[PDB]
Scaffold this active site. Structure first.
Site, PDB file in Angstrom:
ATOM      1  N   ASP A  34       0.690  -1.229  -0.026  1.00  0.00           N
ATOM      2  CA  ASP A  34       0.230   0.050   0.069  1.00  0.00           C
ATOM      3  C   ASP A  34       0.760   1.313  -0.028  1.00  0.00           C
ATOM      4  O   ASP A  34       0.393   2.562   0.048  1.00  0.00           O
ATOM      5  CB  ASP A  34      -0.993   0.161   1.107  1.00  0.00           C
ATOM      6  CG  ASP A  34      -0.335   0.007   2.513  1.00  0.00           C
ATOM      7  OD1 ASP A  34       0.764   0.462   2.628  1.00  0.00           O
ATOM      8  OD2 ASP A  34      -1.120   0.106   3.730  1.00  0.00           O
ATOM      9  N   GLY A  35       2.069   1.234  -0.120  1.00  0.00           N
ATOM     10  CA  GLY A  35       3.040   2.297  -0.155  1.00  0.00           C
ATOM     11  C   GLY A  35       3.509   2.825   1.023  1.00  0.00           C
ATOM     12  O   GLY A  35       4.589   3.699   1.058  1.00  0.00           O
ATOM     13  N   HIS A  93      12.065  29.140   6.637  1.00  0.00           N
ATOM     14  CA  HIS A  93      12.464  29.244   7.825  1.00  0.00           C
ATOM     15  C   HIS A  93      11.642  30.302   8.634  1.00  0.00           C
ATOM     16  O   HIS A  93      11.927  30.698   9.743  1.00  0.00           O
ATOM     17  CB  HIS A  93      13.971  29.501   8.024  1.00  0.00           C
ATOM     18  CG  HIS A  93      14.482  30.559   7.209  1.00  0.00           C
ATOM     19  ND1 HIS A  93      14.287  31.847   7.557  1.00  0.00           N
ATOM     20  CD2 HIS A  93      15.304  30.798   6.176  1.00  0.00           C
ATOM     21  CE1 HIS A  93      14.905  32.777   6.630  1.00  0.00           C
ATOM     22  NE2 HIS A  93      15.149  31.887   5.669  1.00  0.00           N
ATOM     23  N   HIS A 124      20.948  26.372   5.323  1.00  0.00           N
ATOM     24  CA  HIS A 124      20.479  27.506   4.823  1.00  0.00           C
ATOM     25  C   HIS A 124      20.008  28.459   5.914  1.00  0.00           C
ATOM     26  O   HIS A 124      18.652  28.396   5.973  1.00  0.00           O
ATOM     27  CB  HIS A 124      19.556  27.395   3.561  1.00  0.00           C
ATOM     28  CG  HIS A 124      19.253  28.605   2.772  1.00  0.00           C
ATOM     29  ND1 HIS A 124      20.239  29.294   1.758  1.00  0.00           N
ATOM     30  CD2 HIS A 124      18.406  29.695   2.889  1.00  0.00           C
ATOM     31  CE1 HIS A 124      19.991  30.239   1.336  1.00  0.00           C
ATOM     32  NE2 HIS A 124      18.753  30.502   1.976  1.00  0.00           N
ATOM     33  N   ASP A 161      26.006  35.946  -4.929  1.00  0.00           N
ATOM     34  CA  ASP A 161      25.127  37.064  -4.416  1.00  0.00           C
ATOM     35  C   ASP A 161      25.764  37.517  -3.238  1.00  0.00           C
ATOM     36  O   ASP A 161      26.524  37.093  -2.655  1.00  0.00           O
ATOM     37  CB  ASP A 161      23.829  36.628  -3.928  1.00  0.00           C
ATOM     38  CG  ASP A 161      23.653  35.120  -3.242  1.00  0.00           C
ATOM     39  OD1 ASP A 161      24.683  34.840  -2.403  1.00  0.00           O
ATOM     40  OD2 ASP A 161      23.060  34.158  -3.583  1.00  0.00           O
ATOM     41  N   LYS A 184      23.260  41.025  -7.873  1.00  0.00           N
ATOM     42  CA  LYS A 184      22.535  41.091  -9.256  1.00  0.00           C
ATOM     43  C   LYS A 184      21.029  41.548  -8.749  1.00  0.00           C
ATOM     44  O   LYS A 184      20.525  41.114  -7.604  1.00  0.00           O
ATOM     45  CB  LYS A 184      22.318  39.397  -9.798  1.00  0.00           C
ATOM     46  CG  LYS A 184      21.272  39.456 -10.807  1.00  0.00           C
ATOM     47  CD  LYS A 184      20.764  38.216 -11.261  1.00  0.00           C
ATOM     48  CE  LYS A 184      19.816  38.258 -12.167  1.00  0.00           C
ATOM     49  NZ  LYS A 184      19.346  36.819 -12.946  1.00  0.00           N
TER      50      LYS A 184
HETATM   51  N1  APC Z   1      12.768  24.280  -1.139  1.00  0.00           N
HETATM   52  C1  APC Z   1      12.520  25.405  -1.622  1.00  0.00           C
HETATM   53  N2  APC Z   1      12.969  25.956  -2.888  1.00  0.00           N
HETATM   54  C2  APC Z   1      12.859  27.064  -3.359  1.00  0.00           C
HETATM   55  N3  APC Z   1      12.042  28.085  -2.745  1.00  0.00           N
HETATM   56  C3  APC Z   1      11.655  27.943  -1.420  1.00  0.00           C
HETATM   57  C4  APC Z   1      11.835  26.643  -0.713  1.00  0.00           C
HETATM   58  N4  APC Z   1      11.523  26.731   0.427  1.00  0.00           N
HETATM   59  C5  APC Z   1      10.936  28.105   0.694  1.00  0.00           C
HETATM   60  N5  APC Z   1      11.304  29.094  -0.588  1.00  0.00           N
HETATM   61  C6  APC Z   1      10.934  30.065  -0.719  1.00  0.00           C
HETATM   62  O1  APC Z   1      12.041  30.803  -1.030  1.00  0.00           O
HETATM   63  C7  APC Z   1      11.798  32.262  -0.410  1.00  0.00           C
HETATM   64  C8  APC Z   1      12.819  32.639   0.432  1.00  0.00           C
HETATM   65  O2  APC Z   1      12.704  34.161   0.506  1.00  0.00           O
HETATM   66  P1  APC Z   1      13.911  35.172   0.361  1.00  0.00           P
HETATM   67  O3  APC Z   1      13.350  36.545   0.801  1.00  0.00           O
HETATM   68  O4  APC Z   1      14.246  34.906  -1.371  1.00  0.00           O
HETATM   69  C9  APC Z   1      15.712  34.911   0.914  1.00  0.00           C
HETATM   70  P2  APC Z   1      15.493  34.925   2.741  1.00  0.00           P
HETATM   71  O5  APC Z   1      14.791  33.481   3.305  1.00  0.00           O
HETATM   72  O6  APC Z   1      14.715  36.158   3.368  1.00  0.00           O
HETATM   73  O7  APC Z   1      16.998  34.984   3.261  1.00  0.00           O
HETATM   74  P3  APC Z   1      17.913  33.843   3.306  1.00  0.00           P
HETATM   75  O8  APC Z   1      17.980  33.174   1.917  1.00  0.00           O
HETATM   76  O9  APC Z   1      19.238  34.669   3.729  1.00  0.00           O
HETATM   77  O10 APC Z   1      17.567  32.934   4.553  1.00  0.00           O
HETATM   78  C10 APC Z   1      10.438  32.284   0.337  1.00  0.00           C
HETATM   79  O11 APC Z   1       9.354  32.853  -0.626  1.00  0.00           O
HETATM   80  C11 APC Z   1      10.194  30.925   0.492  1.00  0.00           C
HETATM   81  O12 APC Z   1       8.750  30.440   0.448  1.00  0.00           O
HETATM   82  N1  APC Z   2       0.900  -0.708   5.619  1.00  0.00           N
HETATM   83  C1  APC Z   2       0.738  -2.176   5.867  1.00  0.00           C
HETATM   84  N2  APC Z   2       0.543  -3.136   4.895  1.00  0.00           N
HETATM   85  C2  APC Z   2       0.641  -4.474   5.225  1.00  0.00           C
HETATM   86  N3  APC Z   2       1.202  -4.905   6.260  1.00  0.00           N
HETATM   87  C3  APC Z   2       1.723  -3.959   7.344  1.00  0.00           C
HETATM   88  C4  APC Z   2       1.401  -2.679   7.110  1.00  0.00           C
HETATM   89  N4  APC Z   2       2.145  -1.957   8.248  1.00  0.00           N
HETATM   90  C5  APC Z   2       2.576  -3.003   8.913  1.00  0.00           C
HETATM   91  N5  APC Z   2       2.217  -4.200   8.430  1.00  0.00           N
HETATM   92  C6  APC Z   2       2.506  -5.622   9.072  1.00  0.00           C
HETATM   93  O1  APC Z   2       1.335  -6.391   9.265  1.00  0.00           O
HETATM   94  C7  APC Z   2       1.549  -7.088  10.242  1.00  0.00           C
HETATM   95  C8  APC Z   2       0.203  -7.247  11.250  1.00  0.00           C
HETATM   96  O2  APC Z   2       0.644  -8.075  12.302  1.00  0.00           O
HETATM   97  P1  APC Z   2      -0.571  -9.284  12.326  1.00  0.00           P
HETATM   98  O3  APC Z   2      -0.016 -10.471  13.345  1.00  0.00           O
HETATM   99  O4  APC Z   2      -0.824  -9.816  10.969  1.00  0.00           O
HETATM  100  C9  APC Z   2      -2.248  -8.684  12.976  1.00  0.00           C
HETATM  101  P2  APC Z   2      -2.109  -7.814  14.256  1.00  0.00           P
HETATM  102  O5  APC Z   2      -1.766  -6.407  13.847  1.00  0.00           O
HETATM  103  O6  APC Z   2      -1.398  -8.504  15.489  1.00  0.00           O
HETATM  104  O7  APC Z   2      -3.746  -7.732  14.726  1.00  0.00           O
HETATM  105  P3  APC Z   2      -4.742  -6.569  14.054  1.00  0.00           P
HETATM  106  O8  APC Z   2      -4.774  -6.973  12.560  1.00  0.00           O
HETATM  107  O9  APC Z   2      -6.033  -7.183  14.628  1.00  0.00           O
HETATM  108  O10 APC Z   2      -4.460  -5.188  14.544  1.00  0.00           O
HETATM  109  C10 APC Z   2       2.854  -6.753  11.090  1.00  0.00           C
HETATM  110  O11 APC Z   2       3.947  -7.539  10.732  1.00  0.00           O
HETATM  111  C11 APC Z   2       3.217  -5.539  10.224  1.00  0.00           C
HETATM  112  O12 APC Z   2       4.494  -5.208  10.530  1.00  0.00           O
END
Ligand code: APC
Ligand code: APC
Lengths: 284, 286
Positions: A34-35, A93, A124, A161, A184
């Site tokens: 299920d991911g 931040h 950063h 910068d 810039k």
């Molecule tokens: N993972 C990411 N990638 C790109 N941009 C992001 C980001 N996370 C946040 N941002 C955005 O980047 C912007 C940062 O603001 P700016 O004013 O450009 C620099 P600052 O954070 O004010 O100073 P700093 O860069 O010296 O910390 C914000 O609009 C923020 O939402």
């Molecule tokens: N998203 C997921 N999908 C499938 N299996 C998962 C899961 N998350 C956990 N499990 C696994 O599923 C198993 C659940 O244990 P089981 O012994 O089959 C039933 P239980 O959890 O003891 O009782 P229950 O089902 O009544 O809650 C565990 O081995 C666990 O690691």
């Protein structure tokens, strides 16, 4: 000590563990049909200082870190220490508009609730360090970058910068080189750039350094400006090489080489920060 | 009251909001170039009881919930109330081997830290409720399922295994029907199944009910068994229709119809739990 090496950081974590003469403990990890994420650490971590090494940037990376923090609770450990070489969400931040998350705040709060310490390499903006209840250390890749470039012909170290200044000043001082930065700005659609100080780059070899390379727009533009002014060689370095499509080609349009660290592992990870992390661990 | 409708629950959240005469507030949401999540709620949420509706099972859904819980801190709200129609990680509610996470524990602790209450519909195993500092309510789709099948010709309600028994007992009673369950077990590579009690299903119409359909193996097999024994119609219902890996088609090899709720929205979501959630929201007030 025990070093846990998460998926995102296998390379750096391995380098670190070897240097420390210890096992890089990796989880058994898989997705359920299920991911949902499954992790397991079958090694007995009881009574050890634990160092979890993994980035906190992608959805998957966050889930891997959170579930690891739960898994290790199966053991009466001495301490739990998070080391995230690249710390995600550091760019969000504060709130830049009403109703935005302070993403780095809630996430740091979460990590800090389940650990005794946190560390990252070149976060950063250090504002985020203040969001942790436990000591949150900002480590630096400077010395590793200096080690690399000591054997390269460089005239100036350059910040793309007016914010990457301290790092460039320190790196240039340790290389014995001059430095400058590029301001810039856009004024009515048209771009304006100032060199400060206004260094003559004609025929000069330039090392440009930034913290993160994402789209590469910022470094690519400045590299083009400098190439245009007659720079003879341009080296591009960053600590964290994310390289989202298609940053590398934009940058290499005008730069000669790219060299980043192993905080984010890529083909351009030529500079390892293992030594810097080992220092932290040795002292932690 | 303010109802926040997250990406995963747009359909159910919208139905709820409409029933309660209020806006289904959606975030502005996007991914930065580096893949990090951005959310924004520009509406003034100050002074309101907030109800955040979204599932918590995919990586992205978890990030959506967590960042929403941070975004709403920009406002002085009366209360923050999480409703995760489908609660992720409920299946991992203990350590089954040394060094496993109790995923439902840490995630519940996080949600509880940033809310005044949590609710979900038909959690898989109520153990996880005990992991929450705030009140963690387990709502039930039973009445909604009953309302759908009161207009269907049904002879028995059936549990696919010997675990979802209370739900099937409740649903059959409300339908005025008898029920049984199937115990399936493997003994040296062969599968043995027992009906309890040993109901004769020849010519009978059966409603199979489970909490979750994921890979659908258990239900598909049981449907095949029941069909072989002469069942005339087989309806399959579950609260949470995840439908991984062709499960719905595997089930429909031997069942006639599948009907699930809108906790997880798919083309099989014919039974809405909007009224059950609205009743819960009314209780918590606003
Ligand atoms: N993972 C990411 N990638 C790109 N941009 C992001 C980001 N996370 C946040 N941002 C955005 O980047 C912007 C940062 O603001 P700016 O004013 O450009 C620099 P600052 O954070 O004010 O100073 P700093 O860069 O010296 O910390 C914000 O609009 C923020 O939402
Ligand atoms: N998203 C997921 N999908 C499938 N299996 C998962 C899961 N998350 C956990 N499990 C696994 O599923 C198993 C659940 O244990 P089981 O012994 O089959 C039933 P239980 O959890 O003891 O009782 P229950 O089902 O009544 O809650 C565990 O081995 C666990 O690691």
């Amino acid at each position: 000590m025990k070093i846990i090496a998460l998926r995102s950081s296998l390379k750096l974590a391995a380098r670190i563990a070897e240097e420390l003469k210890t096992e890089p403990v990796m989880p058994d990890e898989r997705r359920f049909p299920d991911g949902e994420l499954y992790l397991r650490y079958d090694e007995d971590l009881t009574g050890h200082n634990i160092f979890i090494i993994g980035n906190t940037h992608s959805d998957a990376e966050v889930m891997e870190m959170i579930l690891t923090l739960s898994a290790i609770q199966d053991y009466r450990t001495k301490s739990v220490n998070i080391i995230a070489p690249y710390y995600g969400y550091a760019r969000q931040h504060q709130r830049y508009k009403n109703g935005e998350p302070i993403s780095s705040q809630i996430l740091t709060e979460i990590y800090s609730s389940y650990s005794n310490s946190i560390a990252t390499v070149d976060i950063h903006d250090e504002k985020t360090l203040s969001y942790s209840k436990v000591k949150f250390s900002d480590l630096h890749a400077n010395d590793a970058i200096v080690r690399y470039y000591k054997n390269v012909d460089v005239d100036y170290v350059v910040s793309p910068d007016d914010g990457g200044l301290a790092r460039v000043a320190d790196i240039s001082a340790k290389l014995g080189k001059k430095h400058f930065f590029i301001e810039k700005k856009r004024i009515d659609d048209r771009t304006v750039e100032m060199k400060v100080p206004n260094v003559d780059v004609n025929g000069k070899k330039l090392l440009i350094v930034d913290d993160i390379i994402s789209t590469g727009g910022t470094i690519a533009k400045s590299s083009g400006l400098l190439r245009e002014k007659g720079a003879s060689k341009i080296y591009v370095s960053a600590v964290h090489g994310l390289f989202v499509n298609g940053s590398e080609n934009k940058i290499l349009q005008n730069a000669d080489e790219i060299h980043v660290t192993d905080t984010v592992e890529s083909k351009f990870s030529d500079i390892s920060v293992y030594q810097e992390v080992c220092n932290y661990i040795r002292d932690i």
